[PDB]
């Protein structure tokens, strides 16, 4: 079984497996530290789902001052369910700290070499992708829902690092909270779009007709090695965002009135 990860520390899940790698921040939220209420009750740090701004402006200060990363030098985007990978850095400082509209337009990956900032991406379900290249000092996050998981946004990224000199046997990828094949059903719409770019079977399970479990996660995991990732460089949670109602925000469990946790990282 692939150990977890993720440690809970205060609130925060670090990337406690990344530790030796390199002198990196990286984590993922809780609901734990902030002060949002009701549906986005507590560390609520999504600008775009509803809640009172102030309350998502303040939990974002908490966050900034626990990882000691000022929230002048946070990059965030403007996700749309694609598979567009933007490099960032210097001049996208700020991007989306305090308006969803200011984010990177349409973008759903995020990568930089800067060490100022920290890359943020925002999830209630959906598979947090991380990457780092410590021999290139490059550092990565993307946001995988199924849509951008069979349209290999992992992929995506890999061949921009791989333009820059990186190769895939030197990056490292870790998969992070996401819904399970426990609360997650889809339709063969989406299970034919993952057989159409996964080679051999798609792990699922038929709950009824035209009705399947599946983990997006390990969907993930299997096309990164497809791309080039060695296996032993994947690191993955189990954590489901649906079945932990006390530590996550989950669009299916909430019925779409929730709240968002971020993925991190970002040179200490
Ligand atoms: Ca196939
Ligand atoms: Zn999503
Ligand atoms: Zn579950």
Same mark, same amino acid.
């Given at each position: 079984?692939?150990?977890?990860?993720?440690?809970?520390?205060?609130?925060?899940?670090?990337?406690?497996?990344?530790?030796?790698?390199?002198?990196?921040?990286?984590?993922?939220?809780?609901?734990?530290?902030?002060?949002?209420?009701? @549906?986005?009750?507590?560390?609520?740090?999504?600008?775009?789902?509803?809640?009172?701004?102030?309350?998502?402006?303040?939990?974002?200060?908490?966050?900034?001052?626990?990882?000691?990363?000022?929230?002048?030098?946070?990059?965030? @985007?403007?996700?749309?369910?694609?598979?567009?990978?933007?490099?960032?850095?210097?001049?996208?400082?700020?991007?989306?700290?305090?308006?969803?509209?200011?984010?990177?337009?349409?973008?759903?990956?995020?990568?930089?070499?800067?060490?100022?900032?920290?890359?943020?991406?925002?999830?209630?379900?959906?598979?947090?992708?991380?990457?780092?290249?410590? @021999?290139?000092?490059?550092?990565?996050?993307?946001?995988?829902?199924?849509?951008?998981?069979?349209?290999?946004?992992?992929? +995506?990224?890999?061949?921009?690092?791989?333009?820059?000199?990186?190769?895939?046997?030197?990056?490292?990828?870790?998969?992070?909270?996401?819904?399970?094949?426990?609360?997650?059903?889809?339709?063969?719409?989406?299970?034919?779009?993952?057989?159409?770019?996964?080679?051999?079977?798609?792990?699922?399970?038929?709950?009824?007709?035209?009705?399947?479990?599946?983990?997006?996660?390990?969907?993930?995991?299997?096309?990164?090695?497809?791309?080039?990732?060695? +296996? +032993?460089?994947?690191?993955?949670?189990?954590?489901?965002?649906?079945?932990?109602?006390?530590?996550?925000?989950?669009?299916?469990?909430?019925?779409?009135?929730?709240?968002?946790?971020?993925?991190?990282?970002?040179?200490?």
């Amino acid at each position: 079984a692939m150990r977890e990860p993720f440690k809970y520390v205060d609130g925060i899940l670090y990337l406690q497996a990344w530790k030796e790698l390199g002198n990196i921040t990286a984590g993922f939220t809780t609901k734990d530290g902030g002060i949002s209420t009701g @549906s986005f009750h507590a560390m609520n740090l999504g600008l775009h789902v509803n809640d009172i701004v102030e309350n998502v402006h303040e939990n974002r200060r908490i966050l900034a001052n626990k990882l000691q990363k000022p929230l002048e030098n946070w990059i965030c @985007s403007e996700q749309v369910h694609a598979h567009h990978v933007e490099k960032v850095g210097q001049q996208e400082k700020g991007s989306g700290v305090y308006s969803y509209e200011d984010g990177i337009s349409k973008t759903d990956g995020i990568y930089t070499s800067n060490e100022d900032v920290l890359l943020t991406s925002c999830y209630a379900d959906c598979v947090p992708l991380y990457f780092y290249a410590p @021999s290139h000092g490059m550092i990565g996050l993307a946001h995988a829902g199924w849509k951008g998981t069979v349209q290999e946004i992992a992929k +995506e990224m890999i061949q921009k690092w791989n333009a820059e000199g990186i190769s895939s046997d030197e990056i490292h990828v870790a998969i992070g909270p996401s819904i399970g094949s426990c609360c997650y059903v889809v339709d063969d719409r989406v299970l034919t779009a993952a057989q159409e770019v996964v080679s051999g079977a798609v792990p699922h399970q038929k709950i009824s007709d035209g009705q399947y479990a599946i983990n997006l996660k390990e969907i993930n995991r299997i096309l990164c090695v497809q791309a080039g990732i060695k +296996e +032993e460089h994947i690191v993955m949670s189990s954590l489901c965002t649906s079945c932990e109602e006390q530590l996550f925000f989950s669009h299916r469990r909430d019925q779409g009135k929730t709240g968002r946790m971020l993925s991190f990282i970002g040179f200490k």
